[PDB]
């Protein structure tokens, strides 16, 4: 089997992408944030504290004839940005782009943190990291991809995120029309539960490529590109007037600047992030200070190849017995 679904930016900055997901019988369609950095499929629901719902579409398990309470199961998650959510668990039928999993754990939110409430466009998350990170207790549950894998034509999914435009998540096949050149595959460590890999280096604009190993994760659920402070300093040094602002929380730059590209290495191949992709716009409405899309990971503990990087590529998440990642230009 295969599936194919369009993913759409939630706003004009590509802060996140939403993909429609059918849950239950009859289908209830929710727009979920597909997140290769986590492993829970959780939704706003009829059980969510009413004051914490503000415009999201909700899953109502009592209206699904295929929903079954997973007795005794609870979940609770905290994300790298400080947000969180928790609740109980149903199993139900879940379909993405024509690909159907029966008995998928659907984690129903009883509580969500304010950042989720405040974002009316995101109805939940669909985790695509490794199932060892799933938070369901006392019986850990499998991700949608893990449940679907055996049925797929090939045990893979691909992320093709657009710049200021829709893109595509495919399951079970490589669309060879969706990229240019070849796909370069690189080794993955699953020891932390992430799609963790080692980039071979970087370049700033037209500058020389610096060969250096940069371990990080491919994370569709993180907006920006988070890299070591040395690398980030070298990038922003090429932008007149750019500086790290402790009060804003990262590098800012004059909105009148033209940003240089940033290149990262995948083996001997190179992915070029155009400068435009690094502009996240005014820090507040009407400001002439703009927020940068490349930021230091020094306070995180891990480097993160988020959407800024991933949307410059066609990315293959190969879930074979020994997983690998693939990157191609597009």
UniProtKB/Swiss-Prot annotation:
Keywords carried by this UniProt record: Aspartyl protease, Disulfide bond, Hydrolase, Protease, Signal, Zymogen
BP-aspect Gene Ontology terms: proteolysis
Nucleotide-binding keyword on record: no
Entry annotation: catalytic residues: 35, 199
Record bears the keyword Hydrolase: yes
Disulfide bridges in this chain: 255-290
GO MF annotation terms: aspartic-type endopeptidase activity
Chain segments annotated as transmembrane: none
Ranges of residues in domain Peptidase A1: 17-328
Enzyme class (EC, first level): hydrolase
Catalytic activity, EC: 3.4.23.22
Reactions catalysed: Hydrolysis of proteins with specificity similar to that of pepsin A, prefers hydrophobic residues at P1 and P1', but does not cleave 14-Ala-|-Leu-15 in the B chain of insulin or Z-Glu-Tyr. Clots milk
Family classification: Belongs to the peptidase A1 family.
Protein name per the record: Endothiapepsin
Lineage: Eukaryota, Fungi, Dikarya, Ascomycota, Pezizomycotina
Full-protein interval shown: 90 to 419 of 419
């Amino acid at each position: 089997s295969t599936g194919s679904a369009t993913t759409t930016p939630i706003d004009s900055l590509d802060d996140a992408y939403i993909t429609p997901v059918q849950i239950g019988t009859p289908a209830q369609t929710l727009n979920l944030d597909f997140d290769t950095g986590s492993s829970d499929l959780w939704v706003f629901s009829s059980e969510t504290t009413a004051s914490e719902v503000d415009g999201q579409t909700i899953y109502t398990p009592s209206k699904s004839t295929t929903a079954k309470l997973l007795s005794g199961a609870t979940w609770s998650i905290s994300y790298g940005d400080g947000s969180s959510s928790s609740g109980d668990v149903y199993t139900d039928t879940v379909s993405v782009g024509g690909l159907t999993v029966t008995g998928q754990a659907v984690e129903s939110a009883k509580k969500v943190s304010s950042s989720f409430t405040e974002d009316s466009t995101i109805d939940g998350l669909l985790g695509l990291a490794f199932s060892t990170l799933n938070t369901v207790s006392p019986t850990q549950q499998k991700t949608f991809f893990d449940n679907a894998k055996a049925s797929l034509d090939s045990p893979v999914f691909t992320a093709d995120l657009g710049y200021h435009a829709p893109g595509t998540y495919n399951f079970g096949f490589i669309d060879t029309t969706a990229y240019t050149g070849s796909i370069t595959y690189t080794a993955v460590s699953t020891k932390q539960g992430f799609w963790e890999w080692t980039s071979t280096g970087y370049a700033v604009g037209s500058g020389t490529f610096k060969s250096t190993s940069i371990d990080g994760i491919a994370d569709t659920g993180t907006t920006l590109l988070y890299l070591p402070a040395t690398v980030v300093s070298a990038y922003w040094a090429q932008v007149s007037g750019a500086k790290s602002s402790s009060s804003v929380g990262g590098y800012v730059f004059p909105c009148s600047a033209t940003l240089p590209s940033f290149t990262f290495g995948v083996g001997s191949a190179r992915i070029v992030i155009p400068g435009d992709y690094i502009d996240f716009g005014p820090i507040s409405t009407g400001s002439s200070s703009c927020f940068g899309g490349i930021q230091s990971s020094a306070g995180i503990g891990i480097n993160i190849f988020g959407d800024v990087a991933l949307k410059a590529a066609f990315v293959v998440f190969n879930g074979a017995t020994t997983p690998t990642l693939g990157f191609a230009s597009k």
